[PDB]
Design a protein around this ligand. Structure first.
Ligand SMILES: *[C@@H]1O[C@H](CO)[C@@H](O[C@@H]2O[C@H](CO)[C@@H](O[C@@H]3O[C@H](CO)[C@@H](O)[C@H](O)[C@@H]3O)[C@H](O)[C@H]2NC(C)=O)[C@H](O)[C@H]1NC(C)=O
Ligand SMILES: *[C@@H]1O[C@H](CO)[C@@H](O)[C@H](O)[C@H]1NC(C)=O
Lengths: 63, 636, 902
């Protein structure tokens, strides 16, 4: 369970951690790739709204 | 199918070096390219003299610089031809007659009859750089009537034309114009005005500004104003002050005679108020809300306690407003990429159109992502998109903690889906941190890819191009190894990226339906505005105290080596009477922000619609090219 | 007194520029620390303010760079701000403040500020007695010193007050100039507005419209009269019916397919599409891209058709068909000026023109129509069996004309051919009926200029009221026919007769591309392309317009033409006279002549929105006079607040309890700052009013006290203005010994000299010994014995008319012993003069005391003029008279007998 917000209408997709393609960082915030329908879909998530699973998969792929 | 792409700027400039980008995609060996430029129609070959051979040791990128000389509604064009051995790639690009910009300094803002007006015209091309053209000058009167027409060339004067016109004693009192324009470009005219008048430099200046820079209609404390009164030599003024207020919508004013108040100036500072009762009564007795979108002025008249001297000064523009703030999506791309994240460049101003600092702004709703405005009065705000090709309606708000929710400004906007070849639903996005960029810093530019995994192997590079001052500043490649869904560009900003730059990128592939496809996207990047070089003026003379009349001092002039500096001292008296049409580097940049061939903050409908909208003509050897550019101005 | 800087040893602050340092110092110094440091020693001006230096940098590497404004602050512990206006009206008495600024931390200074006498100004300053006031200013403060004066001299004039501190070395002298202006007001006036056309006006010559000088009947004396002349030279744009829409020309881009003629008819229109769109630069709204995509076709149509080229340099229908006259004749014409469009083999064309004249034309000058092009519908109106040898011959000669200029080298034999047939179509083109064949043949010669009056006005007449040529038949026959004709009209350059034909075309809205349009299509659009490059909107402009001015010695000629920008030539004389203008050339310009001066004064001065009355009378320390100020608003409703800016009379200050009274007023208020300024040195004062009435006169007065007894006390003043505009306001002066607060000045119409001074020479003390020594200077010019006829004592100056008796020393006035003469004195110089009628009077005076010039000139009594009540001989017999008489009689002889030294 990693949650992706849509502040336009305030919806919530839930992405399975295993399905994630790769995790990258923008300043504070975090920004990863899906595997939607073999389409390489995306998802930005705010520093404030970063869960641990995602910060972890990042700190790996980083340092 | 090897594909050969030509990238030129949208509208070319004449007797100026502009540069076009040569690329061959999937190209064995080193390919030859000879760049030709003919007039339209026909074949004068006015600058075909440009040749080059692009290698696989640059991966088939490379360019040739050329200057189109010189001479021979009204709209001229040229056909640009880049032939790769067998293959001919030719575009027709609009061309600007208009040589560059003119800026005209006067030694003062306001003059008497009998005095000479020293004026200077700076002759500089589209890239802010000194030039040698012939320019005619006109001196219109408060009704345009050229009361002296000159015509000098700046050749070897290095951009600077020092002129003079003495004003006859029997002159038509009022608001005099000067009008300069390059001898080749009668339509590129450039104006600066100077009030002619009887007058005598005051003793003191008067500074009137309120507690606020606006009236909050529901602030029963009324529009408080402090008055200031200083002798031009610094010491404070003892006197008395006559101040009166008035509403104005829009051109017409309406004095509020009830609001006429007389106050002593003690230690050079008085304070006067305009009650809400006075204002409401004054208008019409109407409803406070009727009056929003109007504005008021205040009008202070300070007479010394001797009587010898008195000074007028008015602060105008004080707008009456519901919300201390304004949210403009004027910097924000109006095209999103289905699925990919959508970045908004929220721009918040004060009512007085000054940029707001530390203003929490957020997408409309409850616990929404909330970003703070830079010094730019720009915040950023990234929002996740759905895969649907539906229109996107986003509302933003101010989230300032002190302001009531009624008091919070709003603005709604609407991005359209980036249209896509064969509905491939391949996209490209470009993310960047929207801090304030200062040159000698590095910007990281995040090229996000969004196609299906199945063809993503082939995407091996992006081509990235940087527009600045309506000209290709530089460009190159950004490599990407398979499974690299985001690659990051380390962009070194130089003192050449001022006052801003556009970056437009494109990857291409022969994907989906055995047809070539170009994907693209632009981003605009405001740089921290300031001088390319530096110049300062300061006291060579150490400390002293106040330099005494008629005495000598020294002046340190720390400027760019091998440059012509020009000076003028002006008794600050003049600037109590009239402080308009002064030259500020800032006014200059404003000019070059208008003269932008780029007319979109970012992105664009199709691949084509990105390049035109960022001021570029892409055009390939596969039939695939930007729409033709006809309008020398940004279509409104 | 003493222990204080000597006034003479004070250099005053002269220089007060509003801008300066217009300097242009380059930067060449070794670039140490990434940035060239130029040091620049500058000398500041004496203006005590804050300067704002604004540098601009220009580097061919770094571009332009506007530096941040640097402020410098000139300042001084003690100084005078001399507060002038901009300008003063000549003979209008006004008061100037000079404010003294003791900016010491904890030290008052005993100062003596002093106005310097200028002869250009009437004031309580004069050569013999200076204007010194001593005043001490408290620490970190400023006292205001008023100076009431009259400007008598026109132009810029210079006031100069100074000051030094007693016991200390601290002085400051100023001298700002100000504009003194002639009594009157600004006034423009239109001398003349003539119209500048050399074609219509002054027919067949050079237009010479005779402009007067100005009227200037109101024109105040000694005032500049600038005659603003302007030669605005208008343009004229002869509207040309503009081109057919790109959108209707879409269907003319066909991909040339077929054989011999069918390939040809394919290519025919797409050629002319380009050539039109070329000259109407309509490629924009058409689509720039579409050109090269279409241009592709013509190449292919040219190349394809060359394989319909018989090895005789000739063009057949089929692969091997019997060669044609016409088909060949046409492709000669279509290629003829598709040469500019696509470089074509100048051998394959001029070698193909060569074949047609060789084996298809004989001595008569005709061309064979054995040219069966299968479908003869492309051919046009030559298919019909009438004038086929006369009509074709005219068309086929057209094909020679378009490819005439290019081929005249490659084949030199051809030029001969063209000319020869040119005759055979000149002789025979008079007896033709068909209005097709009329029009083609009319073009053929008109090209070669062979068509003058005779056969011109046969072809011309066929024109249906100058709109179309045609007959009964195919309606596309008439359209192609009309065009051929048109081409001629602009070939023979009759722009008069042209336009209305063009309209009849755009009426038919013909765009072509239909069964048998080939020759109709082409011809139409070729004619409309020719037209548009021949077409003038440029209505010939060229003006050699000059006018030899009476004023300047060197003429002013101007050259206003088209493809010239500067359309507003102008020069402005400062003297006013009449002057003719030479106007020759072609076009339409504009001569207007304006003139500014000083129109004479209506409702008086700048004081007609505020009536006030100032009353000075004594009351029942030392002196104490009550000052009553009565104002009223010259308007329609009670005014807002307004200012009462008062000046005290020299050595005065108002009662402190009488100001206490006034402040506690429902509509009155004085600043406590001026109430807690003790008699210290309070000689200025401001009393603010909340509302001045328009209906009653709101008065009030207060006591003043004589703080210091200095004689010759200057008149005070009371200026009263509304807060919102100082400009419109009325100051009035006041003085106990004078009438209304104005200084004694003798003023005669415009001229004004100053009379604030002694009345006669200030010397029973009347030694003859010395009297005679001081009698003979270069100065004195008239020694007279005289006798008062009549006295004219009044309100102004009091004129004494003095009968000349015997003239001792004559000056520059032709005089007898009987010539009566006018001597004038200030009213004030009544008591001191004590004059009487039919009196023996000694009156030796000083030259340039002469009011007007011969013979209305009148001797003024003066600070340098001398007077004596000469005793009557018959009553010299007194022994307290006889002492005087003697000395006087001793003088009278000893002066005149010989004369004075030299
Ligand atoms: C268009 O053509 C011009 C001229 O060929 C290109 O400018 C040139 O670009 C090269 C490579 O980017 C520059 O080399 C650089 O030198 C700097 C040192 O200042 C170094 O830091 C970089 O790593 C790089 O090696 C070269 O100086 C420059 N030459 C000039 C301006 O005269 C331009 O980039 C071309 N753009 C494209 C899209 O091809
Ligand atoms: C002439 O003076 C009048 C008076 O106001 C003014 O309206 C007009 O504009 C002036 N015209 C010129 C040419 O000075």
């Amino acid at each position: 369970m990693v949650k992706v917000k849509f502040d336009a209408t305030g919806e919530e997709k839930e992405v399975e951690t295993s399905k994630i393609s790769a995790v990258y960082r923008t300043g504070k915030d975090v920004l990863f790739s899906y595997d939607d329908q073999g389409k390489i879909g995306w998802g930005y998530v705010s520093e404030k709204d970063a869960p641990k699973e995602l910060l972890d998969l990042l700190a790996r792929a980083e340092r | 199918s090897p594909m050969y792409s030509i990238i030129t700027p949208n509208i070319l400039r004449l007797e100026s070096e502009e540069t076009m980008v040569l690329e061959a995609h999937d190209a064995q060996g080193d390919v030859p390219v000879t760049v030709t430029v003919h007039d339209f129609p026909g074949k004068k070959l006015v600058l075909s003299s440009e040749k080059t051979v692009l290698t696989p040791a640059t991966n088939h990128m490379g360019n040739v610089t050329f200057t189109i000389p010189a001479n021979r509604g009204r709209n001229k064009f040229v056909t640009v031809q880049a032939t790769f051995g067998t293959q001919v790639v030719e575009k027709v690009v609009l061309v600007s007659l208009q040589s560059g910009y003119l800026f005209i300094q006067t030694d003062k803002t306001i003059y008497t009859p009998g005095s000479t007006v020293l004026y200077r015209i700076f002759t500089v091309n589209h890239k802010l750089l000194p030039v040698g053209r012939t320019v005619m000058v006109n001196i219109e009167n408060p009704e345009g009537i050229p009361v002296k027409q000159d015509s000098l060339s700046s050749q070897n004067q290095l951009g600077v034309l020092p002129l003079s016109w003495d004003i006859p004693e029997l002159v038509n009192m009022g608001q005099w114009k000067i009008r300069a324009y390059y001898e080749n470009s009668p339509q590129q005219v450039f104006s600066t005005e100077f009030e002619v008048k009887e007058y005598v430099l005051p003793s003191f200046e008067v500074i009137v500004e309120p507690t606020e820079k606006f009236y909050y209609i529901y602030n029963e404390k009324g529009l408080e104003v402090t008055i200031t009164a200083r002798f031009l030599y610094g010491k404070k003024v003892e006197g008395t002050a006559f101040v009166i207020f008035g509403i104005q919508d829009g051109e017409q004013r309406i004095s509020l005679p009830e609001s006429l108040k007389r106050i002593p100036i003690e230690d050079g500072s008085g304070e006067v108020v305009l009650s809400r009762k006075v204002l409401l009564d004054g208008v019409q007795n109407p409803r406070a809300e009727d009056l929003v979108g109007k504005s008021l002025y205040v009008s202070a008249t300070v007479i010394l306690h001797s009587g010898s001297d008195m000074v007028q000064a008015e602060r105008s523009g004080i707008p009456i407003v519901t919300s201390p703030y304004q949210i403009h999506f004027t910097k924000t791309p109006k095209y999103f990429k289905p699925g990919m994240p959508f970045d908004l460049m929220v721009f918040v101003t004060n009512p007085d159109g000054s940029p707001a600092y530390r203003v929490p702004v957020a997408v409309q709703g409850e616990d929404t992502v909330q970003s703070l405005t830079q010094g730019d009065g720009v915040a950023k705000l990234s929002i996740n998109t759905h895969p649907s090709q539906k229109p996107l309606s986003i509302t933003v708000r101010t989230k300032k903690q002190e302001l009531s929710e009624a008091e919070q400004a709003t603005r709604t906007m609407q991005a359209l889906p980036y249209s896509t070849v064969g509905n491939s639903n391949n996209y490209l996005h470009l993310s960047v941190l929207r801090t304030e960029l200062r040159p000698g810093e590095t910007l990281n530019v995040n090229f996000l890819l969004r196609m299906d995994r199945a063809h993503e192997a082939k995407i091996r590079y992006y081509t990235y191009l940087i527009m600045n001052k309506g000209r290709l500043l530089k460009a190159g490649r950004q490599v990407r190894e398979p499974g690299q869904d985001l690659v990051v560009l380390p962009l070194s900003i130089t003192t050449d990226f001022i006052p801003s730059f556009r970056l437009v990128a494109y990857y291409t592939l022969i994907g989906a339906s055995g047809q070539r496809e170009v994907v693209a996207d632009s981003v605009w990047v405001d740089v921290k505005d300031s001088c390319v070089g530096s110049l300062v003026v300061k006291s060579g003379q150490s400390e002293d105290r106040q330099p005494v009349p008629g005495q000598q001092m020294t002046l340190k002039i720390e400027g760019d080596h091998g440059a012509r500096v020009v000076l003028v001292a002006v008794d600050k008296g003049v600037f109590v009477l009239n402080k308009k049409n002064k030259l500020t580097q800032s006014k200059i940049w404003d000019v070059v922000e208008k003269a932008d061939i780029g007319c979109t903050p970012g992105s664009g409908k199709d691949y084509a619609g990105v390049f035109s909208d960022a001021g570029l003509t892409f055009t390939s050897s596969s039939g695939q090219q930007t729409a033709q550019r006809a309008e020398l101005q940004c279509p409104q | 007194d003493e222990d204080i800087i000597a006034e003479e040893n004070i250099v005053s602050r002269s220089e007060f520029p509003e801008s300066w340092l217009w300097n242009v110092e380059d930067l060449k110094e070794p670039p140490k620390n990434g940035i060239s440091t130029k040091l620049m020693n500058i000398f500041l001006k004496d203006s005590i303010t804050t300067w704002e230096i604004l540098a601009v940098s220009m580097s061919d590497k770094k571009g332009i760079c506007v530096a941040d404004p640097f402020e410098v602050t000139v300042m001084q512990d003690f100084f005078i701000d001399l507060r002038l206006p901009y300008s003063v009206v000549r003979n209008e008495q006004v008061e100037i403040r000079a404010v003294l600024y003791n900016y010491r931390q904890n030290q008052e200074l005993k100062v003596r500020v002093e106005l310097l006498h200028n002869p250009a100004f009437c004031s309580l300053a004069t050569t013999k007695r200076r204007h010194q006031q001593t005043v001490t200013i408290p620490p970190k403060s400023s006292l205001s010193v008023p100076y009431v004066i009259v400007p008598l001299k026109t132009g810029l004039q210079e006031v100069e007050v100074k000051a030094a501190v007693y016991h200390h070395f601290i002085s400051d002298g100023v001298r700002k100039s100000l504009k003194v202006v002639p009594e009157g007001i600004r006034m423009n006036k239109t001398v003349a507005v003539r119209t500048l056309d050399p074609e219509r006006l002054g027919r067949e010559g050079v237009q010479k419209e005779d402009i007067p000088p100005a009227d200037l009947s109101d024109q105040v004396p000694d005032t500049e009269s600038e005659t603003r002349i302007l030669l605005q030279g208008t343009p004229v744009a002869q509207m040309t019916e503009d081109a057919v829409d790109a959108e209707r020309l879409k269907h003319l881009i066909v991909t040339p397919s077929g054989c011999g003629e069918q390939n040809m008819i394919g290519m025919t229109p797409t050629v002319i599409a380009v050539h039109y769109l070329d000259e109407t630069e309509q490629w924009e709204k058409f689509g720039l891209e579409k050109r090269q995509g279409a241009l592709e076709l013509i190449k292919k149509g040219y190349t394809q058709q060359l394989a319909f080229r018989q090895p005789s340099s000739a063009f057949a229908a089929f692969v091997k068909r019997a060669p044609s006259t016409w088909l060949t004749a046409y492709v000669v014409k279509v290629f003829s000026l598709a040469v500019n469009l696509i470089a074509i083999d100048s051998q394959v064309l001029c070698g193909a023109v060569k074949w047609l004249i060789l084996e298809k034309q004989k001595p008569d000058g005709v061309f064979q129509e054995d040219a069966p092009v299968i479908h003869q519908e492309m051919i046009g109106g030559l298919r019909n069996n009438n004038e086929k040898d006369m009509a074709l011959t005219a068309f086929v000669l057209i094909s020679l004309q378009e490819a005439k200029d290019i081929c005249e080298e490659q084949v030199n034999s051809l030029p001969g051919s063209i000319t020869k047939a040119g005759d055979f179509l000149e002789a025979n083109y008079m007896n033709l009926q068909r209005s097709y064949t009329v029009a083609i043949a009319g073009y053929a010669l008109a090209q070669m200029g062979r068509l003058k009056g005779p056969l011109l006005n046969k072809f011309l007449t066929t024109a249906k009221d100058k709109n179309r040529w045609e007959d009964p038949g195919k309606q596309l026959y008439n359209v192609e026919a009309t065009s051929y004709a048109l081409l001629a009209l602009l070939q023979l350059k009759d722009f008069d007769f042209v336009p209305p034909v063009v309209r009849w075309l755009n009426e038919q809205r013909y765009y072509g591309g239909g069964y048998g349009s080939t020759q109709a299509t082409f011809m139409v659009f070729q004619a409309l392309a020719q037209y548009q490059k021949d077409a003038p909107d440029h209505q010939e402009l060229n003006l050699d317009v000059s006018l030899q001015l009476p004023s300047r010695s060197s003429k002013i000629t101007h050259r206003i033409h088209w493809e010239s920008a500067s359309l507003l030539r102008s020069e402005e004389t400062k003297e006013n006279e009449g002057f003719t203008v030479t106007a020759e050339g072609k076009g339409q310009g504009t001569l207007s002549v304006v003139t500014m001066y000083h129109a004479k004064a209506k409702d008086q001065l700048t004081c007609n929105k505020f009536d006030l009355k100032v009353t000075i009378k004594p009351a029942p320390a030392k002196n104490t006079m009550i000052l009553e100020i009565c104002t009223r608003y010259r308007g329609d409703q009670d005014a807002t607040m307004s200012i009462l800016d008062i000046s005290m009379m020299t050595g005065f200050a108002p009662d402190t309890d009488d100001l206490k009274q006034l402040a506690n007023g429902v509509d009155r208020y004085i600043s406590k700052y001026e109430l807690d300024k003790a008699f210290s040195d309070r000689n200025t004062l401001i009393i603010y009013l909340d509302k001045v009435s328009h209906s009653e006169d709101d008065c009030l007065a207060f006591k003043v006290h004589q703080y210091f007894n200095v004689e010759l006390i200057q008149p005070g003043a009371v200026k009263v203005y509304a807060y919102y505009n100082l400009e419109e306001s009325c100051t009035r002066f006041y003085h106990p010994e004078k009438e209304d607060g104005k200084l004694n000045k003798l003023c005669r119409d415009e001229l004004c000299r100053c009379a604030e001074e002694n009345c006669f020479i200030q010397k029973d003390k009347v030694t003859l010994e010395e009297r005679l020594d001081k009698a003979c200077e270069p100065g004195v010019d008239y020694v007279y014995k005289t006798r008062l006829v009549k006295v004219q004592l009044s309100n102004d100056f009091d004129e004494y008319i003095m009968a000349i008796e015997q003239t001792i020393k004559s000056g520059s006035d032709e005089v007898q012993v009987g010539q009566q003469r006018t001597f004038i004195s200030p009213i004030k110089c009544r008591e001191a003069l004590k004059l009487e009628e039919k009196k023996h009077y000694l009156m030796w005076g000083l030259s340039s005391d002469f009011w007007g010039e011969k013979p209305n000139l009148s001797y003024i009594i003066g600070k340098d003029t001398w007077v004596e009540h000469w005793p009557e001989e018959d009553e010299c017999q007194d022994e307290e008279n006889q002492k005087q008489c003697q000395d006087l009689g001793a003088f009278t002889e000893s002066m005149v007998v010989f004369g004075c030294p030299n």
